[PDB]
Structure formats: C-alpha cells, structure tokens
C-alpha cells in the first residue's frame, strides 16, 4: 500500500508548494510579559474580540 | 504656672509618613481599562 502510493519516488522530484525550502528560529512566547501584566491589572484581557 | 521639662525643638524632627493600605493598578483611573481589547474588532498584532 505505501508502493502504490507512491513511496519509490525520488525525492528531488517533490517540490514544495513554495519553491523554497525553509529553517525559522523565531524567538516566542514566554508568558512572563502576560502574567506581569495581569499582576499589576487584572481587570484588562489580552485576548481581543475579533 | 506649670513649669515642665520637655524635648528641646533641634533634637527632634518631624516626618511626613504616607500611609496606604494597597498599591493601585497600572489603570488606575480607568474604569474600564478592558474596553480596549473588546473594541478591537480589526484584530491586534
């Protein structure tokens, strides 16, 4: 079943859907500016309403 | 007349102490400091 779906194929031949390959290091979430600011003000939301 | 010993005025000073029973949020005078996100129909980056 993985034959006949195809796992003999060369993998040049599967390109991306983007033409380019891809390594992202983006630095993120933490979580420390969140909890900060819900201790000095609980009555505000982060989360907005759209 | 009463005559009484008491704490000369240079060996004494006063001080003003500010007394509270809590510290107020960073919104302070806001009274609703939630009307920011909740009016932010376009989304926030």
Same mark, same amino acid.
């Given at each position: ?8 194929? !060369? $993998?040049?031949?599967?390109?991306? %859907?983007?033409?380019?390959?891809? !390594? $992202?290091?983006?630095?993120?979430? %933490? ?20 | ?45």
């Amino acid at each position: 079943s993985m034959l006949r779906n195809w796992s003999w194929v !060369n $993998v040049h031949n599967v390109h991306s %859907v983007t033409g380019t390959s891809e !390594n $992202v290091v983006l630095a993120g979430y %933490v979580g420390l500016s969140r909890t900060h600011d819900y201790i000095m003000d609980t009555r505000s939301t982060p989360a907005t309403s759209q | 007349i009463k005559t009484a010993p008491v704490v000369p005025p240079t060996e004494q000073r006063d001080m003003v102490q500010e007394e509270r029973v809590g510290t107020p949020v960073k919104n302070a005078g806001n009274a609703n400091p939630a009307a920011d996100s909740d009016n932010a129909t376009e989304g926030v980056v």
